[PDB]
Swiss-Prot record, chain A:
<comment type="similarity">
    <text>Belongs to the protein kinase superfamily. TKL Ser/Thr protein kinase family. RAF subfamily.</text>
</comment>
<feature type="modified residue" description="Symmetric dimethylarginine; by PRMT5">
    <location>
        <position position="143"/>
    </location>
</feature>
<protein>
    <recommendedName>
        <fullName>RAF proto-oncogene serine/threonine-protein kinase</fullName>
    </recommendedName>
</protein>
<comment type="subunit">
    <text>Monomer. Homodimer. Heterodimerizes with BRAF and this heterodimer possesses a highly increased kinase activity compared to the respective homodimers or monomers. Heterodimerization is mitogen-regulated and enhanced by 14-3-3 proteins. MAPK1/ERK2 activation can induce a negative feedback that promotes the dissociation of the heterodimer. Forms a multiprotein complex with Ras (M-Ras/MRAS), SHOC2 and protein phosphatase 1 (PPP1CA, PPP1CB and PPP1CC). Interacts with LZTR1. Interacts with Ras proteins; the interaction is antagonized by RIN1. Weakly interacts with RIT1.</text>
</comment>
<feature type="domain" description="Protein kinase">
    <location>
        <begin position="1"/>
        <end position="189"/>
    </location>
</feature>
<feature type="active site" description="Proton acceptor">
    <location>
        <position position="65"/>
    </location>
</feature>
<feature type="modified residue" description="Phosphoserine">
    <location>
        <position position="68"/>
    </location>
</feature>
From Swiss-Prot, chains B, C:
<comment type="function">
    <text>Molecular chaperone that promotes the maturation, structural maintenance and proper regulation of specific target proteins involved for instance in cell cycle control and signal transduction. Undergoes a functional cycle linked to its ATPase activity. This cycle probably induces conformational changes in the client proteins, thereby causing their activation. Interacts dynamically with various co-chaperones that modulate its substrate recognition, ATPase cycle and chaperone function.</text>
</comment>
<comment type="subunit">
    <text>(Microbial infection) Protein on the cell surface interacts with N.meningitidis serogroup B adhesin A (nadA).</text>
</comment>
<comment type="similarity">
    <text>Belongs to the heat shock protein 90 family.</text>
</comment>
<feature type="modified residue" description="Phosphotyrosine; by SRC">
    <location>
        <position position="1"/>
    </location>
</feature>
<feature type="modified residue" description="Phosphoserine">
    <location>
        <position position="7"/>
    </location>
</feature>
<comment type="function">
    <text>(Microbial infection) Binding to N.meningitidis NadA stimulates monocytes. Seems to interfere with N.meningitidis NadA-mediated invasion of human cells.</text>
</comment>
<comment type="subunit">
    <text>Monomer. Homodimer. Forms a complex with CDK6 and CDC37. Interacts with UNC45A; binding to UNC45A involves 2 UNC45A monomers per HSP90AB1 dimer. Interacts with CHORDC1. Interacts with DNAJC7. Interacts with FKBP4. May interact with NWD1. Interacts with SGTA. Interacts with HSF1 in an ATP-dependent manner. Interacts with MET; the interaction suppresses MET kinase activity. Interacts with ERBB2 in an ATP-dependent manner; the interaction suppresses ERBB2 kinase activity. Interacts with HIF1A, KEAP1 and RHOBTB2. Interacts with STUB1 and SMAD3. Interacts with XPO1 and AHSA1. Interacts with BIRC2.</text>
</comment>
Swiss-Prot record, chain D:
<comment type="function">
    <text>Co-chaperone that binds to numerous kinases and promotes their interaction with the Hsp90 complex, resulting in stabilization and promotion of their activity. Inhibits HSP90AA1 ATPase activity.</text>
</comment>
<protein>
    <recommendedName>
        <fullName>Hsp90 co-chaperone Cdc37</fullName>
    </recommendedName>
</protein>
<comment type="subunit">
    <text>Probably forms a complex composed of chaperones HSP90 and HSP70, co-chaperones STIP1/HOP, CDC37, PPP5C, PTGES3/p23, TSC1 and client protein TSC2. Probably forms a complex composed of chaperones HSP90 and HSP70, co-chaperones CDC37, PPP5C, TSC1 and client protein TSC2, CDK4, AKT, RAF1 and NR3C1; this complex does not contain co-chaperones STIP1/HOP and PTGES3/p23. Forms a complex with Hsp90/HSP90AB1 and CDK6. Interacts with HSP90AA1. Interacts with AR, CDK4, CDK6 and EIF2AK1. Interacts with RB1. Interacts with KSR1. Interacts with FLCN, FNIP1 and FNIP2.</text>
</comment>
<comment type="similarity">
    <text>Belongs to the CDC37 family.</text>
</comment>
Amino acid sequence: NILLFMGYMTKDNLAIVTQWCEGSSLYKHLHVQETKFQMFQLIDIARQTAQGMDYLHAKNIIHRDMKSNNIFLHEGLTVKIGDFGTGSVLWMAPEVIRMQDNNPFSFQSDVYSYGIVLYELMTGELPYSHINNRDQIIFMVGRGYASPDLSKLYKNCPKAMKRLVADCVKKVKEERPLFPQILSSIELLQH
Amino acid sequence: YGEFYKSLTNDWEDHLAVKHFSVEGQLEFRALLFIPRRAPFDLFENKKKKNNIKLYVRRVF
Amino acid sequence: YGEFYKSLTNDWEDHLAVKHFSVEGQLEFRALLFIPRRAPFDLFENKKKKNNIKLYVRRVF
Amino acid sequence: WCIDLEVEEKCALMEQVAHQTIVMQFILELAKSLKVDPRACFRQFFTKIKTADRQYMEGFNDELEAFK
């Protein structure tokens, strides 16, 4: 009797390999592509950024390299913070741009950079940007002769946020809040 | 049901439907099963060990 | 090594390569690692629990 | 080896060994068909031919006479 045909007993493989988006950095969507977010959404991004920053500090990690181009958006506007990204100066604190001491990194340094990020989120426009001279930035920021222009902020910016920006960029490190305070303020501010 | 669900999931929207029942017998359990309004982004993707049903005994996780 | 590896894995063919090593200090252990000559027919299946490395203490599983 | 069974009309032994025979033909044909070593088959493959419509051995119950 015959060599009969076999309808082959097939197998269906439904395994997955993950894919990830190289999304725009905040810097890119804010200053290059200049896309726009609703005020609520801008707050959601700031909130997630703070929530990540607090977790780093809890683990005793000082981020230091905090730039809006080092923060990335993903689907659902998930914020991913990393080391993955002028800007050599702009986001750093007045003592750090000065190299006033030996790498005086602290949580407040990260706070300063955070405050700068909040400022650009709340303007769509870089701080000090009526001026662009390199030595003038080192002079005027380092010696305390200019704040960022909080007069440039969105009209829809909650007053509490205007204060938060101002607070996070207060000149003295002893004067600015830590993330637990910042985040608490943001959640209260958002509700 | 909607407030309980928002607390349990941390969702910002309400649920789509819920089944609530008791099994009587030598096994006694209550259960709530909710269907969310949108599939999560990672419904398939995060491979490791959670289909989101928590088991409690005498109300202790 | 060949007879052991057949006995460890139920393979009918030898290993391609084997590495024997040990480590000392606070954490002490010895180990054997084998690269098989063929990919297992179902190596990548996501429905099967892997037996591939076994951990023994003082020679009990 | 079954030639004595055909000569002696030993139907029950021809019938039980037909099961072993179709299994040998299944695993060897499968190995040919897949370009693999016959030793690389598994009892999951026997479970796979247990799914849906199972077997064709109802004709091999005649092979034991039809092969004489």
